[PDB]
């Protein structure tokens, strides 16, 4: 197919061979990350070179390596030793998840802690959480995991209902030593169960819901070719999948009559952090980079037809590598289908007597992932009118704690003695822009209020102002919902028929950005989350807003470093990074299982077309 | 039956008979407004008393009257003569619309202006628009409409493509006189047609859209009882319809186990204003109160099955009065149906091995109206989890002008020589709150950022603060998207099992509010649109944010006068008035017919329930 096709099990196997053959994949080596590389910048480059990037961990304690291999030419293009204390630790390995609980089970401090609380060690689940970087000097260079305890009364019990507060352990998962066990005091362990599948809790199930059937008697309107190439209602794109980012969209273009006009070169959620706002030492270090530290694509669910994806669905089953280089397929990991989207355009004209109504539709490309207690759905939508939209759906079980006697300013009560620490889920959408090609620029557009007086005697006038971001040093922008602030990405060398540079306007939800104090560790490690919009000059090695190795990285790694280059972004190959998230103060209705909460953003054509691009839609 | 039942044809004819019998409806009288009044406050309602309020116009020029009749008792409860120059003119009568073009067609000033542009008067359509209140002293006490011309080249031509700039006329529609004709100079009349059904413009219609069939084999899950009483997935409410407000929701409540718990006593879009931001004298007076001046409900479209409402739809055909008091039915004017809404809750738990997925659904109640070039869809949604949401959908044809040769700061170009003046579409949702009953209170909730230091040593803590609005004087609030500002309506006397007052949280979109200078006529007439949220103490005569008579009415009534009463709203029968709207800088993509743009708000339970209310939702 094209150089944008999904990785084959064969390519994964071929990467495994090349590595072992080069002596890079011994018995103590584990693949922490592996993913195909996107074709480099060009056009007439028919010579295909499928390369894969790999992060290799060594369970002995030896320095890890970043290796790039060429599957097309069975070679090791590069292999470098990483100084994790300098560049950060590799992504948390799924196999290290069990380790924290196992090591702790034989630690006397831990056992002493459980004994004081009368908790059976065999019933205490331990959540292997990322460590971050705080004041523990002995952690620099070491691969640390922190553990919080939750009691599971029985196999099918929801342990989240029973947090063991006042206790936290730090574990060196390489040397296998419990570096520390902190017990700040016994807290009552919440007793009510949160088993949402227990009839005693749910009550008799409803019998009132009649079925809703969504069918496509003639099949879907989109076509899938070359495995992942989508063609639908003038749109054209390639659906990729990466173990770290999940679903990635490539070459989003719109066929405007004769031309296939590019809009976005690459769209992905490049990072997703979940910072907690509880100042208790038991949790004050808690910040989960679901994408950067855990890798969201790795945990993508196999979606069941009729349950997760309703209607006429076309699935993609992406292949990833396991810790040993063996290919693993995520059956039905990606859903593709078109949804009716109500009214597109409507007008009943008195003067002409013409009554006109048209219906809208959206192409949907989604996947759902699970990172411990949270579950997130990632949805990309393409609309008939040219609008592109992203929506994240957050659900799962809330991360719990004990609810302090006397209340709390940073924790809310869900059940008797059960608390839910305040937190945020902040995303970063990386949009490698290609508005009618790569020569793009960004303008910040604000509504402009005008004062009543000469030229505006009735005081009714209002305008808009656009400020072009010319250098990266002036491309770190904040939201301003009050002045209806948006950002327009245009091609200054491609003009519509009214001789105006074609463009697309980004409409943000203007939700709060990172709340943490500016001098905090999380503010420095997830600096991208402190501002709504960033614009950088494209560079193939600038992939994530938080850098390539997020785990235990000290600070300032991604966007702040890239931006510091201060490159020219006025009419250049540029990338837009939009920060957007949810700020959560959990409610009683989020317990025992959370109903979906959503956030997103969208981009609408702004003088991109010469008139409405949906005049050819039939009466339907 | 239920005192909230829709008005029947018989009741309307009876109101006519009662007015006639009372000598209030002779041959010169016209009904400018007629609607049923809601049952009086309380509980011990001694039998049914269906009362209707009527605004009676006199075509001979005599003073109009406001009358309330008891259709049950066959009596006139009150009838007062109105001094329109003081209290405002009655809503525009449908019959007065055509009058503008008719009178102008024989006016020599108008004819000279047309001849100067070489336009055939028989092809010049005139958009009859509300006049507002400006410096025209002779207009005080008279019913005026202003006219803007558009050329219609042939019967089926869209005149909006051909605006005649530099010209405007004012007309007294009662005395049938053209009071003024202002010609500021000729502007080329845009030549390109905007005929969206002309194959020459649309091009060949797409053959790519495959059908999306949505069916309900066993029928809908909601039941319609007593004509307009709906019961669906624990929800209960009555769907009313008023000629001014359109769809109005009454007694929204949720059956939580044994108890039917009220949430919102009455919800409606109590006003909507469309102000224009072009300082040209030809349009600087332009502002319409589609609800208050035109009465959106009377222009509701008859919805076609399959095109307007897809799926298993249950229609209501509300009856309204014509200008003479005879009943008229808007066949299929309201659509009711439930629609699938993706994932409701989902969690795949490692520890328990339990994988759980549930789907969401929403009850939809909608209607679409058309007033001139604009068409608006009003949609109310009720979700399984207890969320209530409203969404307005703006479409139709953009109101045009000429595009100034040297560009414009207040008008955008759509086609060669065709301009689109900037404007807004601002709505006011009046929510008569009844959270678990009438004893309610409103708190403004802001996210609170904390400084790193003692008690927050790692600088990760963040909190929330709630400020109770105790008196109406402190109940006029603005948005603050940056601090995640929301407003919680609670019942200080009804606590959940965790001993917290039950409540609902209002999530606004935080769009810009009224942009006009504060000293402008529109800022005073649309004072409500200058702030995001208002809370008043309920009063039966405080129905609209702009007062009872908006047409050509200055400031002096509405919210600003109500609030001055400075009543107690801390644990009392209160009403929330939320302002939300769209700010439009028309795009080429909006021509020749605009794709739907949306805006709205939603309310989510906030400690209302004792745990998630959807644990009894069965697996698909
Ligand atoms: Co959350
Ligand atoms: Co508009």
From Swiss-Prot, chains A, B:
The active site is at 290 (proton acceptor), 374 (schiff-base intermediate with substrate). Disulfide bonds join 309-335. Transmembrane segments: none annotated. It is an enzyme of class 1 (oxidoreductase). The modification 2',4',5'-topaquinone is found at residue 374. Induction: By phenethylamine. GO terms for molecular function: copper ion binding; primary methylamine oxidase activity; quinone binding. PROSITE patterns: COPPER_AMINE_OXID_1, COPPER_AMINE_OXID_2. Keywords: Copper, Disulfide bond, Metal-binding, Oxidoreductase, TPQ. Signal peptide: none annotated. Its EC number is 1.4.3.21. Topaquinone (TPQ) is generated by copper-dependent autoxidation of a specific tyrosyl residue. Pfam families: AGAO-like_N2, Cu_amine_oxid. The keyword Transport does not apply. Its cofactor is Cu cation; L-topaquinone. Gene3D superfamilies: 3.10.450.40, Copper amine oxidase, catalytic domain. The keyword Electron transport does not apply. Binds 1 copper ion per subunit. Cu cation binds at residues 423, 425, 584. SUPFAM superfamilies: Amine oxidase catalytic domain, Amine oxidase N-terminal region. GO terms for biological process: amine metabolic process. Belongs to the copper/topaquinone oxidase family. Catalyzes the oxidative deamination of phenylethylamine to phenylacetaldehyde with the concomitant production of hydrogen peroxide and ammonia. Homodimer. This is Phenylethylamine oxidase.
């Amino acid at each position: 197919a094209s150089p944008f096709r999904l990785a084959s099990a064969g390519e994964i196997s071929e990467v495994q061979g090349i590595l072992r053959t080069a002596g890079l994949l011994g018995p103590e080596k584990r693949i922490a990350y592996l993913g195909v590389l996107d074709p480099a910048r060009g056009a007439g480059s028919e010579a295909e070179d499928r390369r894969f990037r790999v992060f290799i961990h060594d369970v002995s304690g030896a320095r890890p390596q970043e290796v790039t291999v060429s599957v097309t030419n069975g070679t090791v293009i590069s292999a470098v030793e990483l100084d994790t204390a300098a560049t950060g630790e590799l992504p948390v390995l799924e196999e290290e998840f069990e380790v924290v609980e196992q090591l702790l089970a034989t630690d006397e401090r831990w056992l002493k802690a459980l004994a004081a609380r009368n908790l059976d060690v065999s019933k205490v689940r331990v959540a292997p959480l990322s460590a971050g970087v705080f004041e523990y000097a002995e952690e620099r260079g070491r691969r640390i995991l922190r553990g919080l305890a939750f009691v599971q009364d029985f196999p099918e019990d929801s342990a989240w209902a029973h947090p063991v507060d006042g206790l936290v352990a730090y574990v060196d998962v390489v040397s296998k030593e419990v570096t520390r066990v902190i017990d700040t005091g016994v807290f009552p362990v919440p007793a009510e169960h949160g088993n949402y599948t227990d009839p005693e809790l749910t009550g008799p199930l409803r019998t009132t819901q009649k079925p809703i059937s969504i069918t496509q008697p003639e099949g879907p309107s989109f076509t899938v070719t070359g495995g992942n190439h989508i063609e639908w209602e003038k749109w054209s794109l390639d659906v990729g999948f990466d173990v770290r980012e999940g679903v990635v969209l490539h070459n989003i273009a719109f066929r405007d009559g004769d031309r296939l006009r590019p809009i976005i070169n690459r769209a992905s959620i490049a990072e997703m952090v979940v910072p907690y706002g509880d100042p208790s030492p038991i949790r004050s270090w808690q910040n989960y980079f679901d994408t950067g530290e855990y890798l969201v694509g790795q945990y993508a669910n196999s979606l069941e037809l009729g349950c997760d994806c309703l209607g006429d669905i076309t699935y993609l089953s992406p292949v990833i590598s396991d810790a040993f280089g063996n290919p693993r397929e995520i059956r039905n990991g990606i859903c593709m289908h078109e949804e009716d989207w109500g009214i597109l355009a409507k007008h009943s004209d008195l003067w002409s007597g013409i009554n006109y109504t048209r219906r809208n539709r959206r192409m949907v490309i989604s996947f759902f992932t699970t990172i411990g207690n949270y579950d997130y759905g990632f949805y990309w939508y393409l609309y008939l009118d040219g609008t592109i939209e992203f929506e994240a759906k957050a659900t799962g079980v809330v991360f719990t704690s004990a609810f302090p006697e006397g209340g709390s300013d940073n924790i809310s009560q869900l059940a008797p003695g059960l608390g839910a620490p305040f937190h945020q889920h902040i995303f970063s959408a990386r949009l490698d822009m290609a508005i009618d090609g790569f020569t793009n620029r960004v303008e910040e557009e604000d509504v402009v209020r005008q004062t009543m007086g000469p030229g505006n005697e009735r005081g009714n006038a209002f305008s808009r102002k656009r400020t072009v971001l010319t250098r990266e040093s002036e491309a770190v922008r904040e939201a301003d919902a009050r002045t209806g602030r948006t950002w327009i990405i245009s091609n200054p060398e491609s003009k519509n028929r009214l001789n105006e540079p074609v463009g697309y306007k980004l409409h943000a939800h203007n939700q709060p950005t990172l709340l943490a104090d500016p001098g905090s560790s999380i503010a420095r490690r997830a600096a991208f989350a402190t501002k709504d919009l960033w614009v950088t000059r494209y560079a193939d090695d600038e992939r994530y807003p938080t850098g390539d190795f997020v785990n235990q990285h000290s600070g300032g790694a991604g966007l702040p470093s890239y931006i510091a280059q201060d490159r020219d972004i006025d009419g250049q190959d540029i990338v837009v990074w939009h920060t957007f998230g949810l700020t959560h103060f959990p409610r009683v209705e989020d317990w025992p299982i959370m109903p979906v909460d959503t956030v997103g953003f969208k981009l609408r054509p702004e003088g991109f077309f010469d008139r409405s691009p949906v005049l050819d839609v039939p009466a339907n």
